[PDB]
Short mmCIF file of C-alpha atoms in Angstrom, two decimals:
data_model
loop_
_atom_site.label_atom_id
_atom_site.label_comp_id
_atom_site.label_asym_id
_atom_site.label_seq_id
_atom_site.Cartn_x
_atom_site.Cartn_y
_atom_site.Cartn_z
CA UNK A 105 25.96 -66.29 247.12
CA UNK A 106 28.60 -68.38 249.17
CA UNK A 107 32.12 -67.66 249.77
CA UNK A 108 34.79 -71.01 249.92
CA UNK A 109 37.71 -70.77 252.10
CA UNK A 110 40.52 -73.87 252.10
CA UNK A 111 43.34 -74.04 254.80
CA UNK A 112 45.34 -76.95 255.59
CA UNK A 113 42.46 -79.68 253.95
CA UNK A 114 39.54 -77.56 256.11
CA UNK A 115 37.09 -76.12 253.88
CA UNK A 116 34.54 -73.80 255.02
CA UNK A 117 31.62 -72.39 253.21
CA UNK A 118 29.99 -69.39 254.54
CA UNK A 119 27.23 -66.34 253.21
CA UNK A 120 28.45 -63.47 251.48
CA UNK A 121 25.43 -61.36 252.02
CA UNK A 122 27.03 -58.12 250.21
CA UNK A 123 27.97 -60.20 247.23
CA UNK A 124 25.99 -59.75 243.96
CA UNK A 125 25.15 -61.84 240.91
CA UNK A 126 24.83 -60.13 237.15
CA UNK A 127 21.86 -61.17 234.85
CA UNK A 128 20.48 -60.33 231.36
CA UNK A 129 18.77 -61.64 228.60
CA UNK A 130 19.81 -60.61 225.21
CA UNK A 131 16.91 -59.34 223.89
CA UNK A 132 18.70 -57.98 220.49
CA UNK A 133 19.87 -60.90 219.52
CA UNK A 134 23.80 -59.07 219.06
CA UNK A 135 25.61 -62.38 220.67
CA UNK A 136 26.26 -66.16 219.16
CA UNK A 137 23.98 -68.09 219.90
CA UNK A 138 25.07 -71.10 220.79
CA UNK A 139 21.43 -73.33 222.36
CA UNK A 140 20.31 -74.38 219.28
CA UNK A 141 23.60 -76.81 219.11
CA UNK A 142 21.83 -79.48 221.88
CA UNK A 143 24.39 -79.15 224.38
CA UNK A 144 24.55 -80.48 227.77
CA UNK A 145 23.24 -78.28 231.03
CA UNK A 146 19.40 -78.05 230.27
CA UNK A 147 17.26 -77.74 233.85
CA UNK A 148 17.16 -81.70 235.02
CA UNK A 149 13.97 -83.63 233.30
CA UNK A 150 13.32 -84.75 237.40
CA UNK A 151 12.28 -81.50 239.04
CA UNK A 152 14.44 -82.93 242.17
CA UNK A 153 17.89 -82.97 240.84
CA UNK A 154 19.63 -79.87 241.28
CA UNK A 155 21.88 -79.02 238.41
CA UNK A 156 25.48 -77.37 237.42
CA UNK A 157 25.25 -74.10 235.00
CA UNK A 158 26.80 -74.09 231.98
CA UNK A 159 30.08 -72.21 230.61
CA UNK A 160 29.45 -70.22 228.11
CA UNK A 161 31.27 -69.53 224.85
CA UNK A 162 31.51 -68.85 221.22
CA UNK A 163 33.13 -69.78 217.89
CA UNK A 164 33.89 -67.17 214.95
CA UNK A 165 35.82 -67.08 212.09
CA UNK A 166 39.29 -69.26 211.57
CA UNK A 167 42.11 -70.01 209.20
CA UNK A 168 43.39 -72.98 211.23
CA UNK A 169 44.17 -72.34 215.08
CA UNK A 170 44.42 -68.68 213.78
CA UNK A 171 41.95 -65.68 213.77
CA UNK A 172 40.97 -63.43 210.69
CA UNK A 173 40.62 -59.94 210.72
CA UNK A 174 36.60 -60.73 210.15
CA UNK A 175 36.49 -62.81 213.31
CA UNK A 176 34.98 -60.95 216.14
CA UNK A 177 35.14 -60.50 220.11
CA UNK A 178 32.57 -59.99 222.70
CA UNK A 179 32.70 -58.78 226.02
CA UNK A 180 29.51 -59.73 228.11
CA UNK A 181 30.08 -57.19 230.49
CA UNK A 182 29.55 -54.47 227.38
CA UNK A 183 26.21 -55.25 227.85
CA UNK A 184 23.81 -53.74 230.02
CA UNK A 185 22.76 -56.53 233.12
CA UNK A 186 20.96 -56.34 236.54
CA UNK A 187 23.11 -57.10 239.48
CA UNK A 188 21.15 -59.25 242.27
CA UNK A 189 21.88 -59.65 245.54
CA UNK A 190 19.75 -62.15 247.97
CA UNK A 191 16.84 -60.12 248.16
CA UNK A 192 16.88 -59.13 244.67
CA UNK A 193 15.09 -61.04 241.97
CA UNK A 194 14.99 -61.53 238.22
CA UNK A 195 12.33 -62.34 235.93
CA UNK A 196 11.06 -61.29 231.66
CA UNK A 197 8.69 -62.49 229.67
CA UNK A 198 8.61 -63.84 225.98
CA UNK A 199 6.24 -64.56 223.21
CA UNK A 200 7.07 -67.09 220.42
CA UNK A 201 6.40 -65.83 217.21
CA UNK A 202 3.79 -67.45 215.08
CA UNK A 203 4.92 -71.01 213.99
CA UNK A 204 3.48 -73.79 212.53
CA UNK A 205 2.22 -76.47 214.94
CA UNK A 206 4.53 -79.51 215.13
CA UNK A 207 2.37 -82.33 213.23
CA UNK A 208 2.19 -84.71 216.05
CA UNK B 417 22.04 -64.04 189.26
CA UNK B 418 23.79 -61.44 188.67
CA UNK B 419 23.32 -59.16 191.57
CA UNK B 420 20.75 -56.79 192.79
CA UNK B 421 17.21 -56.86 192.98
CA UNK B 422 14.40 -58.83 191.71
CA UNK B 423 11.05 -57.16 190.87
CA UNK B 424 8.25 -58.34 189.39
CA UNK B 425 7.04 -54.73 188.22
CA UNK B 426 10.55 -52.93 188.00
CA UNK B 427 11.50 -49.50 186.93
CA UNK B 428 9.77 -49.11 183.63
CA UNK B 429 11.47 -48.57 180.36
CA UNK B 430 12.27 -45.21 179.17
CA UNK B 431 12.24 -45.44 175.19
CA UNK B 432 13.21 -41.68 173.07
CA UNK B 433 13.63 -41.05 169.30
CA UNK B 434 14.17 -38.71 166.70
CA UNK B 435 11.04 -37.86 164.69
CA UNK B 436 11.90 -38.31 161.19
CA UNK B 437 11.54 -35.36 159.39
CA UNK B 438 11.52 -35.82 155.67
CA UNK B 439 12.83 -33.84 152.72
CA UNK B 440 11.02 -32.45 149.82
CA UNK B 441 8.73 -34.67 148.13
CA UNK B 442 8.35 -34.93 144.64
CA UNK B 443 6.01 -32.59 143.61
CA UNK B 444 3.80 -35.59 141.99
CA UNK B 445 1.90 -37.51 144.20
CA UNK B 446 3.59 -41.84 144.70
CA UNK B 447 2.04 -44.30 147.35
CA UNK B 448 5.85 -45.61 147.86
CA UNK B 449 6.74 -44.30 151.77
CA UNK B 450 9.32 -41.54 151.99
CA UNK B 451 12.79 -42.68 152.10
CA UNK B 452 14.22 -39.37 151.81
CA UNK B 453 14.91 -37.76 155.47
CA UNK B 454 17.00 -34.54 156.79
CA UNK B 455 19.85 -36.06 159.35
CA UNK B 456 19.10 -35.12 162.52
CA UNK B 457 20.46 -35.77 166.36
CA UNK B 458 19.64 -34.27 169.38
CA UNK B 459 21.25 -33.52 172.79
CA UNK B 460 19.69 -32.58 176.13
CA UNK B 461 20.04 -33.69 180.16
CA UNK B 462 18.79 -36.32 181.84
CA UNK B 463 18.87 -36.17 185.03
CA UNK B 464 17.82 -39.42 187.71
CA UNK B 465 16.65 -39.77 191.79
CA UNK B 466 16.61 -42.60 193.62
CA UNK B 467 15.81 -43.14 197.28
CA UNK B 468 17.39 -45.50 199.36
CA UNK B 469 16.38 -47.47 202.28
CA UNK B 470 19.15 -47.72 205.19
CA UNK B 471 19.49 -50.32 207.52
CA UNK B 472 21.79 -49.45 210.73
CA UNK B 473 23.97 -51.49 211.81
CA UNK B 474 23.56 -52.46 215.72
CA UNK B 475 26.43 -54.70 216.36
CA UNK B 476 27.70 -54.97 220.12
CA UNK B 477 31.36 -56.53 218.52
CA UNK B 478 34.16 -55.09 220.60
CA UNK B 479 36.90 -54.97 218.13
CA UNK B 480 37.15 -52.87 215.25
CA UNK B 481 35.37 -54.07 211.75
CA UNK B 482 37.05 -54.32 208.31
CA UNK B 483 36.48 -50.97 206.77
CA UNK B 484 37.09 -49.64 203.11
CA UNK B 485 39.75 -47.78 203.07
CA UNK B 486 41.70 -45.64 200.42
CA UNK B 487 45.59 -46.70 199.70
CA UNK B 488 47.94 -44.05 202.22
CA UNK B 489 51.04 -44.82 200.19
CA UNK B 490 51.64 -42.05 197.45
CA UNK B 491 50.59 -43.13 193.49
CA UNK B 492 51.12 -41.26 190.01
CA UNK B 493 47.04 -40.49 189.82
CA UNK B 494 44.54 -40.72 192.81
CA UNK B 495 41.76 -43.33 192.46
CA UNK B 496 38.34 -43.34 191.11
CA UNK B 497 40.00 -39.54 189.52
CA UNK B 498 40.62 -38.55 185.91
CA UNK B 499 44.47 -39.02 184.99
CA UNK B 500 46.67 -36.34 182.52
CA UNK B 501 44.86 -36.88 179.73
CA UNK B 502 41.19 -36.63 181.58
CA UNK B 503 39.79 -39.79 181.29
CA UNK B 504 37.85 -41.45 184.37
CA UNK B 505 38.58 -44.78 185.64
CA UNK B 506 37.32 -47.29 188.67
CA UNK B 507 41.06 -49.17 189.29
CA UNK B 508 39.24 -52.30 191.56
CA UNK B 509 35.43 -53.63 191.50
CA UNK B 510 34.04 -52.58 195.86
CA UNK B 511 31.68 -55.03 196.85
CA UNK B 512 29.31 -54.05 199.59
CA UNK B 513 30.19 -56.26 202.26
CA UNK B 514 32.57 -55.25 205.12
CA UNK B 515 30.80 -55.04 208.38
CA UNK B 516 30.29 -58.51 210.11
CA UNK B 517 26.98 -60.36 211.96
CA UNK B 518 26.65 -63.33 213.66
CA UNK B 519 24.58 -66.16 212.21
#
């Protein structure tokens, strides 16, 4: 985790060491979910390139530009998540559920 | 179509009569079958249990969900009561949908 500091066009980047980073899968399922769309910000295809995260966010309900009282809110931090620091690491496991095979 | 449901094998029919119980027959034997019956009715409780299946709801949403909710403002009769003359009535159809998911 790296701190950015700007005076007068000098820009200096330094290590926050104290600074902490918040993960967590949802594992419920109780978010949109919004990969199945094929957006942009997948890891690289070239194991080499080093790559931007994605923003995330969500759609709900509309009348035009305008909300209805069905459409919903979500606050990611009213979720349980692990906070990291440099040391720390982060890692889960998943198993697909049975699917046919692709016919290749 | 309609609503509900399906089931191959559902809750079986429940079919009830009156035995007929005839009136005097002639006195000399006929083959003809008896037309002649004493009128009869009968009256009795039924009574019915179902059990129901729940399933909670586990939404993380932040703001408050659409709820059903009984009219605050004053009225002549309450709903889903009987009125003056004691007659029950359901003033609008409730649908069971109100709480919200995500695709």
């Amino acid at each position: 985790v790296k701190e950015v500091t700007q005076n007068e066009g000098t820009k200096t980047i330094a290590n926050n060491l104290t600074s902490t980073i918040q993960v967590f899968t949802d594992s419920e399922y109780q978010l949109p979910y919004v990969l199945g769309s094929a957006h942009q910000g997948c890891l690289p295809p070239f194991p080499a390139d080093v790559f931007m995260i994605p923003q995330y966010g969500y759609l709900t309900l509309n009348n035009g530009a305008q909300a209805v009282g069905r459409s919903s809110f979500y606050c990611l931090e009213y979720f349980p998540s692990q906070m990291l620091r440099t040391g720390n690491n982060f890692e889960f496991s998943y198993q697909f559920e049975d699917v046919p095979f692709h016919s290749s | 179509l309609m609503g509900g449901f399906g089931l191959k094998h559902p809750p079986p029919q429940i079919l009830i009569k009156n035995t007929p119980v005839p009136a005097d027959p002639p006195t000399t034997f006929s083959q003809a079958k008896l037309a002649s019956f004493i009128t009869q009715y009968s009256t009795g409780q039924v009574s019915v249990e179902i059990e129901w299946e729940l399933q909670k709801e586990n939404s993380k949403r932040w703001n408050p969900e659409i709820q059903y909710t009984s009219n605050y403002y004053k009225s002549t009769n309450v709903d889903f009561a009987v009125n003056v003359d004691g007659t029950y009535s359901e003033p609008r159809p409730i649908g069971t949908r109100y709480l919200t998911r995500n695709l």
